[PDB]
Amino acid sequence: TITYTSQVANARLGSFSRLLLCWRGSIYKLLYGEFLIFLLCYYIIRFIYRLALTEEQQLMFEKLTLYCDSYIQLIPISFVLGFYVTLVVTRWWNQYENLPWPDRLMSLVSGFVEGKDEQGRLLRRTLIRYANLGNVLILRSVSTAVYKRFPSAQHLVQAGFMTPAEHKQLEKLSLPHNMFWVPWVWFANLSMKAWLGGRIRDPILLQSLLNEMNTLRTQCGHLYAYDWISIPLVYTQVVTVAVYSFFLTCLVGRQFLNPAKAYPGHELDLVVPVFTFLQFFFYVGWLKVAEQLINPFGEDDDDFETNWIVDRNLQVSLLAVDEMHQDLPRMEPDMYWNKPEPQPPYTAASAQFRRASFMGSTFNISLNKEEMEFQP
Amino acid sequence: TITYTSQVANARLGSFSRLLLCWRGSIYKLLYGEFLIFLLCYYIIRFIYRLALTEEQQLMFEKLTLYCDSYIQLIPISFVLGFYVTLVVTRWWNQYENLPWPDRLMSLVSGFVEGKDEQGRLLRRTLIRYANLGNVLILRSVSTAVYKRFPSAQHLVQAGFMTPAEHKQLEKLSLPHNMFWVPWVWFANLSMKAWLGGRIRDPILLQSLLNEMNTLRTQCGHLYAYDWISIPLVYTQVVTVAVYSFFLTCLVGRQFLNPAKAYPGHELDLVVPVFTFLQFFFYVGWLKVAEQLINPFGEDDDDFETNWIVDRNLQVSLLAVDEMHQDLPRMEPDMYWNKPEPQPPYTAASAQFRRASFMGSTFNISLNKEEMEFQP
Amino acid sequence: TITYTSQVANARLGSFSRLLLCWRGSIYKLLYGEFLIFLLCYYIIRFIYRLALTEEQQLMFEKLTLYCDSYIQLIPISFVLGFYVTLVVTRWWNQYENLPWPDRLMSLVSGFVEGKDEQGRLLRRTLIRYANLGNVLILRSVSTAVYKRFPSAQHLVQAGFMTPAEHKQLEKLSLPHNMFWVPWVWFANLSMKAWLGGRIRDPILLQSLLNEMNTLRTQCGHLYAYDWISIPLVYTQVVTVAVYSFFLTCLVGRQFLNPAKAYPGHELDLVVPVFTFLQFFFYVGWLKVAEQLINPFGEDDDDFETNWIVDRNLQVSLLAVDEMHQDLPRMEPDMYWNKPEPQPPYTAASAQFRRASFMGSTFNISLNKEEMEFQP
Amino acid sequence: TITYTSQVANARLGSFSRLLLCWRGSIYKLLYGEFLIFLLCYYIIRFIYRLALTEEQQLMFEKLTLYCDSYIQLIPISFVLGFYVTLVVTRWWNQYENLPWPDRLMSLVSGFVEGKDEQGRLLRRTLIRYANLGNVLILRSVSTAVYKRFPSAQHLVQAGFMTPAEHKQLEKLSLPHNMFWVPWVWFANLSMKAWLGGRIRDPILLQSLLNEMNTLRTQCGHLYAYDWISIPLVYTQVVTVAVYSFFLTCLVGRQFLNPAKAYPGHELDLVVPVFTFLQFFFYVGWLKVAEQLINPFGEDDDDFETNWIVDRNLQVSLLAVDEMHQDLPRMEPDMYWNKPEPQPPYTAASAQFRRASFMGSTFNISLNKEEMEFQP
Amino acid sequence: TITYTSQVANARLGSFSRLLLCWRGSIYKLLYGEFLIFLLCYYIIRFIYRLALTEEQQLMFEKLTLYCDSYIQLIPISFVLGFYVTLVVTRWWNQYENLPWPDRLMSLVSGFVEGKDEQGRLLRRTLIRYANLGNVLILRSVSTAVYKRFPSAQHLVQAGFMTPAEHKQLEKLSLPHNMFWVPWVWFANLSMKAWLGGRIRDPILLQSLLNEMNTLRTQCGHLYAYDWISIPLVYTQVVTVAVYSFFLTCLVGRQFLNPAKAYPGHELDLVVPVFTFLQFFFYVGWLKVAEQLINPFGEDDDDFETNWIVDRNLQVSLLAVDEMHQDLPRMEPDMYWNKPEPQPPYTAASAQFRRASFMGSTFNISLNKEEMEFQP
């Protein structure tokens, strides 16, 4: 993902203006090809009109150029694009929110499941690795960036996400459906067995682990649903038909006619129509926003770093459930042990950030003494 | 459902342009009939004006064509369609989200309910089959694709969703309402009996099963509500009246008059009005989006595959609660058993997907030493 | 509520076109009176201009007709109506979602509360009847369709929702507020007493019952809030002022002047202005959508069937907690008892609905062998 | 709050038309002053142009009037107002939803905390009074209607919301922040002490009370956040600049020039410009909607009745936790004790409200016998 | 944050008009620089046209000015800005809601964890300080206002948020990722150890503490996600391109030509174009709204006071868990101890705020006696 949050931290002189100089993930890279095709078509038509067309043919073309320009509607094209792009952006953010993070589950698994011995170490590692396996199984089906990393289930075995025994078990259970739901059932069975084995003292704790596990299951199901149930094809087709019909119309209607005839609005001849290219950039970039955001799991530049997400999740989970289990910093009295009102200091650069506490909007209301007395 | 997610993975040269070549679930199949009716009416009126109308009649028709075109409003028609289609799409996605998936319930039922013997096997299978029966009972009432598969309750018995004893019990309880709520009460009673029978050791576990059961109940209730409380008929009628009045106006106002009279804007005569057909395609396809999405449980091409959902749910549920119960892969140390920092390898195709971790937008801010010192 | 879901199941030839033939709950019944008033005013003004006005008066009227038409703005009127109607529809759906259904509570009450004897039967019936009483108490205050059925609290006693002892107790507790909150406190006290009496074995179960009870309490509170805090009166007044000012302007500006003067745009005289009536139908029907949906608990035709909801709720609750308690269908092995992969059959009409399972958007990506190898 | 729900129950002949006769909370009272200022300025400018300006000055003014009118843009002003007013209304409804109601907490406190003796009575009363104190502490900081009732913390002591011991304790804990968070910590400590004292038998019940307590804490925090983090000042300034610039332009551009010069569109002179006042009413009322709704806790007429909310909450809480604790209506068999299907009667006025149950949209689908047979 | 809630409490005469006099956080400070640049460019072009351009050059410039003005589109620019600014504002409010407040956690920690001795004091303080440390760790990565206060992890040690032992432990666990997730795992381990140590009597209480802890974890994860996954760069670039292209067009098209040529619309020459500056203020301020709100954690004036939030959180948490633990106000009978209906008095200023209780919209419906009788 292209992150520019640091650049737009402050609303300064042209803070968004500086963003026009970015290339990666920009509108520039998305539509240079379409812009070049538009230029080629426009200049080909212009040269044909200038040279090949005879006087009567030029007159007929002139009438068409006049007719096409009047039709050029775009309050409707803005309407359709705005409702669509809003839909696409909302779905894109929901897709990101439904990404499963094992941080709530890994904390619980680190805490509840007991045993410093090798058995407890193995139990905790496998319990968190089942969640990671479910996440990677859904991601390699939803994203083309993770599929290229794990083309087949043997690649998951080679990468350490799946042990060979789990691979054999998953093959034995094979059904004509996506198998991303198996690890959650494995986790439920293993945690139940752990509770029966004494590793989890009180069942309330087992219920807590399952709830943080089924929340991950729901998030993965939402990812699968967003992958499967795409934005309706008819709506995308309507939007692209509108945009491309607009610009095919502009190919003729925005043509600069012969100044000799002196048609209204064509008095001056310029070699390039700046506004049509500017309208092209604006409208086609608006379409490209939805085009890039419609599938955020691809391998574009503004698409999510799903590979990094997978790697992080595995690393932090295996660290928390194994080395951080019952290894805590020495508990010592704070700096503010006997200070009733902790006031951490401010750096010189951050001195101005000190503000008085907001006590509510009614703090500054002034009343007379007669106004403040109670009535019977 | 028409899935094109793989095609639009990357914002490439005309990625949406390639979607205009699709037929199934497209705008093409939805509105070819209306387009043909529009063509027939337009050419009939054109031929009548050319031939049947006399000179005074042609003059009166010309005035009408001029008058109708000026009225042709569409910033309002775009407004009404955009607010409606947004409503329809939001309701469509909510309807999909309210589809019940037994994956959270089946994991719990596989884990908690104990017994490898035939009694436990039967208990788990019936507990999950009650949830599947509730789901199919609501779906055959909400969707015309599942009703054609189970026209009567005897078809549910023949398909294995309902045992004959359950069919008799459901007939005995008959009330003048939809009976989709019976299986949830059956599930509650059966799980309570199982807890009294020792199959579920600690009640906390019974509470967990009921919560995952009542969430499914709420989802099914939302499906029934969306089926019953449709989008208001007045709002749909207003939208279709707007669109069809627009195009009935365009039938006359967009007519190409006699070039001999040389009216303003009718200097050149073309046999086909490309813009009116393009506006027809755009606006009628915008209407068809809402028309197709208003009832997503039909048997269109972009409607949900409810039959496949039912079949999957039954298969995966009966697999998880029966064969996967207390059958777990052999627990063995991982590939990363003694590696502090797991770093799974990258394929050659996926090498570029490796990214540095994002440490926050303030990581790159630089400060002087005097700026970094604390103040008293 | 007017349900047309079956009619719009398939996007067929004019599926919305067939909805224009409906009368009940339609735009036709909503605005025929306003349309007739508009016709009467328009023709009265037309006759006055034709006859009563003298030549100078007719000239002054002509100038006014010309002036009024130019002002006729409606991109703004569409804007205001669209933002409002969206607000009204969102609130309408939220109001429906906040309707309380005792299905989650009745399942729990049927399961947890024990005793086949008359004492347990009475306890379960009263526990669910308290929830039904709370629901009807909020509904008779929020809806004018249920108030006409229970005008006074004695009608609730006569209808069986309230026993005379409960009526006396509710009268004794009388406060100058709506008393819809009493049954929830009664339910809490009664369930606590039942747990102390041994009818509910383990408190976890009592906590489950209370949570499903307080969710109903929150839903009823939301209904009361939606009834009390209406859409701001200023916003409704602004919308209606806009619409009615528009059409009062159209009463003069859209008048067909004398063709003899040959004003621009008034060359041809027609007795009826079709577009003004079409704009009237569109805009006034758009207003009527919000007008009908602003209070969905009235007794219109598209308003919710609150009386039916109350009756159903009572019937299904009293059935589930009394006859269905610990009465379960005989537990027998399924049709798929030894079939590893259940495949329910398909009817001849539903054969085409069989689809292959979606395995994810990356299933069809093809890679070379060199692309699939891991890198060091 | 101005409640007109009863008036708009039915979509009848001019149901919204009758709302134009309301004064309190109307657009009439909100903008009469601005309308009078606009009238005064418009007539002052008109008189200056008629009298003070000489012939050349009048000609220059005429040119300006012509120039200003053309600029008069308002599709943009509608756009900005619509996006803003939608934001303001959404925030207003969220602010109302975040109002804390102790009804869920008071039911639990009435049920769980045991003891008919004076100790239990005092314990329950103080437990619910802590929640009421937290609610009033946040409300007197968020609303200017409650601050005028409790200007100082001594007023809370005098009104019974705070005992003198609690006032002393709150003063002793004083920090330079809003102290609305203290009562929740007091409640947690007191409920923990009650559980240690035997008043709450099983901790599950203590967890239930705390959850209903922390939900209230979250709602109060949201109220404080909505008070503190207002809608951005820049966005409000942009909207008001747009509206007021529009109407300052209309002060000159909409001026009725001398008919003697016979400018286009100024042929007829009227003393009052009805459309400009109508556009003024529409646009300024649209702005006043957001202006009134931006702070719903003031003391306007459509602002929330926070004082009544506080009084109700205290009354119902102290009633439920004290007199209604373990005082239940006599449990007796229902009217429907032996009736399998309860059918409550209908009044004569409500007879038409009886409807047949909706069995789903697929109930009426008809199939042939060959269509209904299963296929191998 | 700029708080003006007190100023807009009442919809009074020009309540928003008074907001135009504010400077801090206003549109004035945001766009004075861009306005000055626009003025300089406009006057430079005007002087060049007046002086440097010759008669033929002036004629060509005049034609360009005429051509540019006609293109000046802005219904589209309003559309794009409105959809964007709505997106930015929604994300801004979600970012604020995801701010973690330890108030729910600190109440639980104060209540449940037992021990007045130094061991319990230390345990409670460290448990709440872990949550505060997680919050500050995410905030110093998400906000540039907190990073300037804690440039390095040693600053957290010096400020008391992190003890040296925790700093050493965090360094030992170092991974190439953001380490904001460590304190939650530390909290889980420490609370588990406390439960094993007897400080937390019943595990249900441990489950409650973890749930309030993982909710904070989810909120911090959402903050990190909002920081990392910014609004797509292509969409921001499209919006700024639209706005700046509009105003570059206005630099020429809105130029006041020579009145001597007497072009249509340029009859009168004014030195300043008021409308272009007014359109500049409106559109650029609309853009500046999103520009300021895109990163609400900067150190602007309307950005959140994250430093104050951090300081408050630490102070109130350390106060509640340490001094307020098992220190409760003396429990005494209320003022309303024997009053059945508490009626707190009203001040003289607040007398008018007394309102009658709303009993529902159907309270005032009147029915005849025949209407009120039940039917068989």
Q: Hey, what amino acid is at D290?
A: A
**DSSP H or E run through A375:** strand A374-375
- Contact (Cβ atoms closer than 8 angstroms) between residue C180 and residue C224: yes
- The CA distance from A271 to C172, in Å, is 90
- Contact (Cβ atoms closer than 8 angstroms) between residue B286 and residue A242: no
- The CA distance from D108 to D118, in Å, is 19
- The CA distance from C237 to C283, in Å, is 16
| Chain C residues inside the 8 Å CB shell of E207 | none
Quote the longest CA-to-CA distance of chain B: 99
Strand ranges (DSSP E) for C88-219?
A: none
- Contact (Cβ atoms closer than 8 angstroms) between residue E100 and residue E222: no
**Strand partners of residue B375:** A346
C-alpha torsion C269→C272→C274→C280, nearest 10: 130
| Chain E residues inside the 8 Å CB shell of D28 | none
**CB distance from A141 to chain C under 8 Å?**
yes
| DSSP characters over E125-160 | HHHHHHHHHHHHHHHHHH-HHHHTT-SSHHHHHHTT
Interface test with D, best of B146, B227, B231 (most D CBs within 10 A): B227
All partners of chain D with 3 or more CB pairs under 8 angstroms? A, B, C, E
- The CA distance from B166 to E248, in Å, is 75
Structure tokens, C172: 């004794």
C-alpha torsion A166→A168→A172→A177, nearest 10: 60
Distance of CA B116 to the CA centre of its chain: 40
Phi, psi of B347 (to 5 degrees): -75, 165
Structure tokens, B61: 């028709």
Structure tokens, B185: 């009460």
Burial class (CB in 10 A: 0-12, 13-18, 19+), A20: middle
Phi, psi of D346 (to 5 degrees): -120, 140
- Return the SS3 of D30: helix
Looking at chain E from residue 60 to 89, which residues have their Cβ under 8 Å from any Cβ of chain B? 75
- Beta strand pairing status for B374-375 and A346-347? antiparallel
| Chain B residues inside the 8 Å CB shell of C342 | 160, 314-315, 318
- Contact (Cβ atoms closer than 8 angstroms) between residue B206 and residue B214: no
| Chain B residues inside the 8 Å CB shell of E83 | none
| Cα dihedral sign, C137-C142-C147-C151 | positive
The position carrying tokens 């500054």 is A364
Q: Hey, what amino acid is at C128?
A: I
Q: Hey, what amino acid is at C356?
A: A
Is C262 known as a binding-site position? no
- Contact (Cβ atoms closer than 8 angstroms) between residue D155 and residue D123: no
- The CA distance from D37 to D56, in Å, is 29
Structure tokens, A175: 């059904």
Select from D205, D23, D28 the least CA-distant residue to D110: D205
Q: Hey, what amino acid is at D196?
A: L
CB contact (8 A) between residue B237 and residue C285: yes
Under DSSP, the state recorded for B344 is: -
For C254-342, where are the alpha helices, taking DSSP H only?
A: 274-293, 306-322
C21-26 long-range contacts (CB < 8 A, ≥24 apart) are C22/B233, C22/B237, C24/C301, C25/B232, C25/B233, C25/B234, C25/C1, C25/C300, C25/C301, C25/C302, C26/B233, C26/B234, C26/B237
- The CA distance from B127 to B193, in Å, is 11
**Strand partners of residue B374:** A347
- The CA distance from B52 to B46, in Å, is 10
Structure tokens, D172: 């002793």
- Contact (Cβ atoms closer than 8 angstroms) between residue C362 and residue A299: no
Coarse DSSP helix, strand, coil percentages of chain C, rounded to the nearest 5 percent: 60, 0, 40
* Length reported for chain D: 376
Select from C186, C57, C180, C75 the least CA-distant residue to C130: C186
| Chain A residues inside the 8 Å CB shell of E60 | 268
CB atoms within 10 A of CB D12: 16
Under DSSP, the state recorded for A157 is: H
- Contact (Cβ atoms closer than 8 angstroms) between residue D337 and residue C151: no
Closest chain E residue to the Cα of D239, Cα to Cα: E282
The position carrying tokens 């089942």 is A130
CB contact (8 A) between residue A178 and residue C362: no
- The CA distance from C229 to D302, in Å, is 9
Structure tokens, D370: 């060959």
**CB distance from B172 to chain D under 8 Å?**
no
Buried/exposed A313-329: b ≥16 CB within 10 Å, e otherwise: bbbbbbbbbbebbeebb
- Contact (Cβ atoms closer than 8 angstroms) between residue C233 and residue D22: yes
| Chain A residues inside the 8 Å CB shell of E230 | 1-5, 8
Select from B127, B139, B144 the least CA-distant residue to B98: B139
* Length reported for chain A: 376
- Contact (Cβ atoms closer than 8 angstroms) between residue A344 and residue E314: yes
- The CA distance from D176 to D196, in Å, is 33
Under DSSP, the state recorded for C52 is: I
Angle between helices B274-293 and B233-253 (to 10 degrees): 170
Structure tokens, E107: 């109440």
Select from B231, C230, E181, E59 the least CA-distant residue to A101: E181
**Strand partners of residue E374:** D347
CB atoms within 10 A of CB B107: 26
Structure tokens, E356: 């009658």
Method: cryo-EM
CB atoms within 10 A of CB E286: 28
- Beta strand pairing status for B374-375 and D346-347? unpaired
Distance of CA D101 to the CA centre of its chain: 15
Select from B238, B286, B265 the least CA-distant residue to B68: B265
Q: Hey, what amino acid is at B104?
A: R
For chain A, where are the alpha helices, taking DSSP H only?
A: 27-47, 55-71, 75-97, 103-112, 118-142, 144-147, 153-158, 164-172, 182-196, 203-228, 233-253, 274-293, 306-322
Phi, psi of A95 (to 5 degrees): -60, -40
CB atoms within 10 A of CB E117: 9
| DSSP characters over D39-88 | HHHHHHHHHIIIIIS-HHHHHHHHHHHHHHHHH---HHHHHHHHHHHHHH
Select from D373, D314, D293, D253 the least CA-distant residue to D102: D314
Is E315 known as a binding-site position? no
- Return the SS3 of D347: strand
Select from C201, E109, E202, C190 the least CA-distant residue to D203: E202
Structure tokens, E198: 């007897």
**CB distance from D97 to chain C under 8 Å?**
yes
**CB distance from C155 to chain E under 8 Å?**
yes
- The CA distance from A269 to A276, in Å, is 14
- Contact (Cβ atoms closer than 8 angstroms) between residue D257 and residue D263: yes
CB contact (8 A) between residue A360 and residue D140: yes
**Resolution, Å (one decimal):** 3.1
Coarse DSSP helix, strand, coil percentages of chain B, rounded to the nearest 5 percent: 60, 0, 40
* Length reported for chain E: 376
| DSSP characters over B163-220 | -HHHHHHHHHT--SS--TTHHHHHHHHHHHHHHHTTSSSSHHHHHHHHHHHHHHHHHH
- Contact (Cβ atoms closer than 8 angstroms) between residue E334 and residue D163: yes
Buried/exposed B81-90: b ≥16 CB within 10 Å, e otherwise: bbbbbbbbbb
- The CA distance from B158 to D373, in Å, is 11
- The CA distance from D252 to D255, in Å, is 5
Distance of CA E211 to the CA centre of its chain: 26
Distance of CA B42 to the CA centre of its chain: 36
Structure tokens, C320: 């589930």
**Which CA distances in Å does B149 have to B158, B244, B311, D77?**
11, 36, 12, 55
**DSSP H or E run through C347:** strand C346-347
- The CA distance from A86 to E235, in Å, is 11
Structure tokens, E103: 């108030």
**CB distance from D348 to chain E under 8 Å?**
yes
**Which CA distances in Å does C192 have to C196, C215, D325, E180?**
6, 18, 10, 44
**DSSP H or E run through D346:** strand D346-347
- The CA distance from B316 to A195, in Å, is 25
- The CA distance from D60 to D82, in Å, is 36
Among candidates E141, E155, E295 on the partner chain, residue whose Cβ is nearest the Cβ of B360? E141
Q: Could you tell me if residue A268 is left (phi over 0), alpha (psi between -120 and 50 degrees) or otherwise beta? A: beta
**Which CA distances in Å does E369 have to A290, C151, E373?**
63, 10, 7
CB contact (8 A) between residue D295 and residue A361: yes
**DSSP H or E run through C374:** strand C374-375
Select from A186, A190, A194, A184 the least CA-distant residue to A214: A184
Q: List CB contacts of E3: < 8 A, sequence separation 6 or more.
A: A358, A361, D228, D229, D230
Closest chain D residue to the Cα of E313, Cα to Cα: D177
How many Cβ pairs closer than 8 A exist between chain C and E?
44
Report the half-sphere exposure of D21 (CA within 13 A, side-chain side). Answer: 6
Report the half-sphere exposure of C115 (CA within 13 A, side-chain side). Answer: 18
- The CA distance from E302 to D230, in Å, is 10
Select from E212, B349, B334, E221 the least CA-distant residue to A132: B334
- The CA distance from C60 to C53, in Å, is 9
Select from B65, D296, A366, D8 the least CA-distant residue to E11: D296
- The CA distance from A22 to C90, in Å, is 40
The position carrying tokens 């009475």 is C122
Alpha carbon of A244: minimum distance to chain B alpha carbons (Å)? 9
C-alpha torsion C348→C349→C351→C352, nearest 10: 150
Q: List CB contacts of D360: < 8 A, sequence separation 6 or more.
A: B140, B141, B142, B147, B178, B224, B227
Alpha carbon of C339: minimum distance to chain A alpha carbons (Å)? 13
- The CA distance from E353 to E107, in Å, is 34
Phi, psi of E151 (to 5 degrees): -60, -35
CB contact (8 A) between residue D372 and residue B151: yes
**Which CA distances in Å does E211 have to E104, E188, E214?**
10, 10, 5
Is A52 known as a binding-site position? no
The position carrying tokens 């579920």 is B200
How many Cβ pairs closer than 8 A exist between chain B and C?
300
**Which CA distances in Å does C261 have to C255, C264, C265?**
14, 9, 11
**DSSP H or E run through C375:** strand C374-375
Select from E281, A348, E51, C82 the least CA-distant residue to D240: E281
- The CA distance from D260 to C7, in Å, is 63
Q: List CB contacts of C193: < 8 A, sequence separation 6 or more.
A: D326, D328
Q: What Rg do the C-alpha atoms of chain D give, in angstroms? A: 31
**Which CA distances in Å does B114 have to A210, B185, B186, B191, D175?**
17, 21, 19, 12, 55
Strand ranges (DSSP E) for chain B?
A: 346-347, 374-375
